[PDB]
């Protein structure tokens, strides 16, 4: 397997799964925030 960092396939898979769980939480909050600002003050 090609590896520049030193991690293995399982380790990378696990790190990625926790990283994507935080991407979605941050992004879901951003979606709710953006939806409330348009109902208050529409742009577009």
- Residue 44 DSSP class: -
Quick one: 14 or 36, whose CB is closer to ligand SPN?
Answer: 14
Residue 10 is encoded by which pair of tokens?
């399982």
Contact map string, positions 11 to 40, toward its own copies, x by CB under 8 A: x--xx------------------------x
Quick one: 12 or 28, whose CB is closer to its own copies?
Answer: 12
Q: How far apart are CA 13 and CA 17, in angstroms?
A: 6
Specify whether the CB–CB gap between 20 and 12 falls below 8 A.
no
**Where does this chain bind ligand SPN (CB under 6 A)?**
2, 11, 14-15, 18-19, 22-23, 26
């Amino acid at each position: 397997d090609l590896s520049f960092t030193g991690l293995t396939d399982e380790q990378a898979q696990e790190l990625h799964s926790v990283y994507m769980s935080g991407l979605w939480l941050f992004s879901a909050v951003a979606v709710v925030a953006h939806l409330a600002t348009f109902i208050w003050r529409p742009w577009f």
